[PDB]
Amino acid sequence: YVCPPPSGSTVVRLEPEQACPEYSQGRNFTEGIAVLFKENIAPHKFKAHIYYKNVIVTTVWSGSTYAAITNRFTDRVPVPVQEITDVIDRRGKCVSKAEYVRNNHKVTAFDRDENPVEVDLRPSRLNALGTRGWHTTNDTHTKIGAAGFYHTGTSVNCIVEEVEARSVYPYDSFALSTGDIVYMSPFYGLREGAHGEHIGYAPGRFQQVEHYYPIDLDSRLRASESVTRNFLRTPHFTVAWDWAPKTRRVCSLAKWREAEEMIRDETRDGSFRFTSRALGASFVSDVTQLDLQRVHLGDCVLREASEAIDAIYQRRYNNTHVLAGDRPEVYLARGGFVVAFRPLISNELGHLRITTGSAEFARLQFTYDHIQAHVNDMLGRIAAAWCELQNKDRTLWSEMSRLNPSAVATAALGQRVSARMLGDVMAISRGVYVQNSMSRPLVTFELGDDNELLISRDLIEYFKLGSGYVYYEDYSYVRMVEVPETISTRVTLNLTLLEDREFLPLEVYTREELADTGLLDYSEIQRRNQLHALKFYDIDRVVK
Amino acid sequence: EVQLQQSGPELVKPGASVKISCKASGYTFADYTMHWVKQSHGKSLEWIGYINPYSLFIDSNQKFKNKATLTVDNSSYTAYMELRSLTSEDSAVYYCARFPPYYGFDSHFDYWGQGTALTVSS
Amino acid sequence: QIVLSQSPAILSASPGEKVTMTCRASSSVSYIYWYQQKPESSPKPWIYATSNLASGVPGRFSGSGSGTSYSLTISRVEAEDAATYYCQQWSYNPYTFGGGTKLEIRR
Structure with a gap:
């Protein structure tokens, strides 16, 4: 390229040092x-006892060669609260007579159709810890008498069973492990202001005994601590449980x-x-x-x-x-x-x-914010160091302006410019033979540095010509040789990229699998067993 | 019929001790609690406390914790109240009442005594 | 203690007038229990469980109420009903009787 001489037309300086903010190295x-x-x-879980008399009434047609069950009627009947606290607790016995109300009539069942007697509560054979039951008889009385008649016999089995009870919010009812639902708050009491809770029964059903000592039916050992014992008579059982205030045993927040x-x-x-x-x-x-x-x-x-x-x-x-x-x-x-x-x-x-x-949103918020705060601290230091490096390098660009002032204009602008030192400001100005064979070969064109031809001789009379170097020996041309060996002071910074990672769905248990856990499914058992009369019998035919 | 026969009027000098009886007839004595109330002349009723004559549990009032003790014998079917450290503010009719051993809707003082006039003077 | 304030201290009714009396409780109690006493006699159970009548009491006595407000009303007052009437609770220790309402039949 050819360089025209710069005049005092357009001048420019170098940009001075510039300030830049600091990263936040301290958080509150x-x-x-x-x-x-x-x-x-x-749910709210507590222990309770159930007291009932299992009454079965069986009717038998007795033939000459055989017997046939005509009816088999099982009813469960409550044990009165007076019999819980005066024969079952005192003596471990239970009367063989059941008096109860049914269809608004006072009715009575006798064991073996005999006179009443107190029978000792013996443990069940299948009694394990936490699921303990007691019963009076092991037999179901059946009258199988003379041929050609019906015969009816009555069994009364006094059962005491230790159950677990569960109550869910708002604690207006609880359910026993037998399957029985009690329509009453477990925190109800007729005393100490516990009467505002939900009772769904008559007032004669409920009864509360203060300073009660539980007597274990296997060990006959009264407990050391007393408790207030709630009693509730249902049409089918009496449940007994310990009273506690609602605000001391239930929270809506769990740890x-x-x-x-x-x-x-x-x-x-x-x-x-x-x-x-x-x-x-x-x-x-x-x-x-x-x-x-x-x-x-x-x-x-x-x-x-x-x-x-x-x-x-x-x-x-x-x-x-x-x-x-x-x-x-x-x-x-x-x-x-x-x-x-x-x-x-x-x-x-x-x-x-x-x-x-x-809590999956909080794991992502932790992971994002901890990787955000590091990359903002790291890149706020490289921004602060790049700003400082360019300031100390500006001293070096000013020192190569007093000598070779035309290189600082070519680097700062981009085009091969020519600058002259006009004091403390720079003025910028924006048929090829081989050579004459006779320091630098700046004589005629048909020759300074960086392929810039001067319009004079300025030397004392290698050289780079285009993309080649012309070799001189005692001021005489030899050849346009090339040089393959190159030194380079460039530092390298090889920064790769994050590769894309695809996140396919990945769950340990699916929704159908996590619902297929359990022995019995109530919706599948019922949609098979309510089809039983339509599947094995003929409902649509009517005799005449 | 249920009858709660109670003791007689007793003039007692100050500082002494009085035992007031209450004899029952007509019910099983050992499965009802026995309560005691106080009625000064021209005023209302104040509750002393009770005793359960099967578990021998006594629950009393805090105004009468140092002035009354309650005991029952199982043989003569009687309940007693021992009033001690007497003052002239302890002259009243002292009644004896029957109450169930549970708390239901129908738990109330269903049968009363007839009263013992107690007099602390000289 | 639960204070059971009986509003009409003395109540003078005329034989035939429907007369009410109220017992006001400090805190809420489960039930209320009414007792009748005459001069020189023991108290007698009159209404239990806030609305149930005792053995041998005329049906003109009826009680109602809940919570902290309870009431005893007489339908047709007679001269044999002149006595004092006490409300009572056992929902807290100690058991507390009310003040008393002396009914005076104005003849």
Whole structure:
């Protein structure tokens, strides 16, 4: 290229050093100690006893060669509360007579159609621990008498069985392990203000005995502790269970996993962020605390919190730190979690219904924010070091402006420009023979550096010509040789890319598999057994 | 019929001790609790406490924890109330009442005594 | 203790007038139990379980109420019904009787 001479037409300087901000090397975090609470989805489970008399009434046609069961009528009948506390508890015996009401009439059944007697409750043969039963007879009385007549006999079997009882929210009923549903709150009482609970029976059905000592029917050992014993007579049994107040045995919030080294991130303005590196989750709550007077039955979320915040306060941080407030901070987190947080200061320093989903959103929020905060810190340092490197390099670009001032214009602009040093500012200006054979060969064209031909001789009279080098020896041309060997001061930075990873669906158990667990399925058993009369009999035919 | 025969009027000097009886007839004595009430002259009824004459459990009032003790013999079918450390504010008619050994809807003082006039004077 | 404040202390009714009396409880109790006492006699059970009448009491006595408000009303008052009437609870320790309503038949 040919270079015209620069004039004083257009001047320009170099850009000076420039300032640039700093990365945020400090966040407003608060180390603490926290426990987490979820929705209680588990029912209220308690122990109970059932007392009934199993009455079967069998009728037999007695033939000459055989006997045939005509009727077999089984009814279960309640044992009165006076007989629970005066013969079963005192003596371990039960009368062989059942008096009960049925079709609004007082009716009576006698065992073996005989006079009543007290019979000892013996244990069942199949009695295992937790599923213990007691019964008076092992026989079912049947009268098989003379030929040609019907004969009816009556068995009365007094059964005492230890059952488990379950109650689900709002605790207006409970169900026994026999399958029986009791339409009454298990927290009902006629005393100490427990009468506002739901009773679905007559007042004569219910009865409560204060200062009761349970007597075990195998060991005949009265218990050391007393209890208030509720009694309820049903048309089919009497259930007996221990009374406890509702607010002491039931919460709507259940304890989930604890967090030893919880950090309360307040870097994002307007919200809190509870990060546990041991759980692997970050929970985002608001600033205002939860009012635990608004949640129904949420009263153990603060006494079980402080009993376990303090229980590991005396295990990890006692010599190095102290708590603050003596009442933990209770927050409603995103997704339905209750974060009972307690700060940890240094030694040198209309009800609400809470429904809890899954915690998969908090694992992603932990994983994203921990990889966000590192790549913003890392790339805020390479930005701060690139800004500083270009400032100290500007001293080197100014020193090659006093000597060879035309190289700094070619590098800064891009086109092969020519600059002259006009004091402290630069002015920019934007038939080929081989050579004359007789320092630099700048004589005539038909020759400085970087293929720039001068319009004069300026030397004392290799050289690079185009894409070649012309060799001279004692000021005489030889050949246009090439050089393959090249030195390079360029540092290399080979940065690859993240390859794409596809995430196919992957579940350990599917929905059909997780519902096919259990011996019996009630919807499949019923849609086979209610087809029984249509499958093995003829309903649509009518005799005449 | 159910009858709760109770003791007689007793003039007793201050600082002494009085045992007041209540004899039952007409029911099985050992499966009903026996309660005691107090009625000063011209005023209302105050509950002392009870005794269960099968488990010998006594539950009493906190105003009468140091002024009354309750005992029952199983033979003579009687209940007793021992009033001690007497004051002139302990002059009343003291009744004896029958109550069930459970708490149902029909648990009430179904049969009463006839009263013992107690007088603390000189 | 549960205070059982009986509003009409003395009540003067005329034989034939429907007269009510109310017992006000401090906290909520399960049931209320009414007792009648005359001068120089033991108390007598009169209404149990807030609405059930005892043995040998005329049907003109009827009681109603729930929670902290209870009431005893007489349909047609007679001269044999002049006595004092006590409401009573056992829902808490100690058992507490009310104040008393002296009914005076204004003849």
